């Protein structure tokens, strides 16, 4: 499933995450379009041999196992299968078991790299929220 | 005890290049991102840049981008700031800053007083 | 560059009284400005961050309100070692920009 930004910031601020550890929500919808582009379906295959997840490109060596990574611990205990629902509510509750451990934001590389330092409101101008 | 200590005092002959150094400890270093910050008496303060040591990717301020190189040694955890050619300008004190993860800078080193 | 304007840049003050700093940004920098106070003698001490956030371990006594552009310190009970330059920094974009200071001198 494919989101439209407004649809998807609607559904991550219904869900509390709009400055949820500081982060506004901008960020936290700057980065689901650079990590996968607005696509709940999205996959992405490290050098480790493991595997990003959805959405969010959640990472399976620590927060989810996804049965192909040795190394996990699966820290927000669920089948990495569920990360890559229609639905973000997975997606969401691990992103936040994610950014409340001691690296924040930066555990999402496209949101260092693409929203680190520019204005991230300009990802919800427009959505009525 | 998050601990960024910057090296001594330099005396630099114009044009000659000085390399300055922050040693960082009390937290896991490659997870933070460095800055560099720049004070001479009545100007503000100024922005070089910053790096994540990770992936030693570097953003830099436009007006320092010719003048200045950010680089970090993970294994001993030093973030490093080069001047390539110091002109008169460039006497200063320079800053060392961890980033809080929103970009403000919560720890701050000592500073570096370079007299070209 | 988002221009940051401190306002003024000295203040004299008496012990107890409050004070108020203000910082405009050339443009609006959505409620990301920091402040921080400089004691000679001292590392830089980040006092809040983002708009109204309280760096951790501060006296209550710090508060920080604006939104886009214009932003202020505010500083009750005047403590004869809270007076130090005070330099705010908007931290929504890059570059990293930081105002002029105000000095706070303890008044005689």
């Known amino acids: 499933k494919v989101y439209g930004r407004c649809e998807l910031a609607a559904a991550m601020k219904r869900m509390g995450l709009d400055n949820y550890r500081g982060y506004s929500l901008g960020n936290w919808v700057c980065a689901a379009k650079f990590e996968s582009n607005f696509n709940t379906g999205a996959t992405n295959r490290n050098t480790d041999g493991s595997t990003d997840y959805g959405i969010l490109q959640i990472n399976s060596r620590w927060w989810c196992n996804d049965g192909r990574t040795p190394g996990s611990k699966n820290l927000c205990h669920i089948p990495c299968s569920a990360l890559l629902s229609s639905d973000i509510t997975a997606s969401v509750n691990c992103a936040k078991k994610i950014v409340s451990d001691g690296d924040g934001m930066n555990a999402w590389v496209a949101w260092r790299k693409h929203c680190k330092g520019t204005d991230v409101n300009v990802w919800i101008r427009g959505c009525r929220l | 005890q998050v601990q960024l200590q910057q090296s001594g005092a330099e005396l630099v002959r114009p044009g000659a290049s000085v390399k300055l150094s922050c040693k960082a400890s009390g937290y896991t270093f490659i997870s933070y991102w460095i800055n560099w910050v720049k004070q001479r008496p009545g100007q503000g303060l100024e922005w070089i840049g910053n790096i994540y040591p990770s992936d030693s990717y570097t953003n830099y301020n436009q007006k320092f981008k010719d003048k200045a190189t950010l680089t970090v040694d993970k294994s001993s955890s030093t973030a490093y700031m080069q001047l390539s050619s110091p002109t008169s300008e460039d006497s200063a004190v320079y800053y060392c800053?961890?980033?809080?993860?929103?970009?403000?800078?919560?720890?701050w080193g000592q500073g570096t007083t370079v007299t070209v | 560059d988002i221009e940051l304007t401190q306002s003024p840049s000295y203040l004299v003050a008496s012990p107890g009284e409050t004070i108020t700093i203000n910082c405009r940004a050339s443009?609006?920098?959505?409620?990301?400005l920091a402040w921080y106070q400089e004691k000679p003698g001292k590392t830089n001490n980040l006092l809040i961050y983002?708009?109204?956030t309280l760096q951790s371990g501060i006296p209550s006594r710090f508060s920080g309100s604006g939104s886009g552009t214009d932003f202020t310190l505010t500083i009750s009970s005047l403590e004869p070692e809270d007076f130090a330059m005070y330099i705010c920094?908007?931290?929504?974009?890059?570059?990293?920009?930081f105002g002029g200071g105000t000095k706070l001198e303890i008044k005689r």
């Open positions: 800053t961890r980033d809080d993860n929103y970009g403000a800078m919560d720890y």
């Open positions: 920094q908007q931290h929504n974009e890059y570059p990293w920009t």
């Open positions: 443009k609006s920098i959505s409620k990301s």
């Open positions: 983002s708009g109204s």
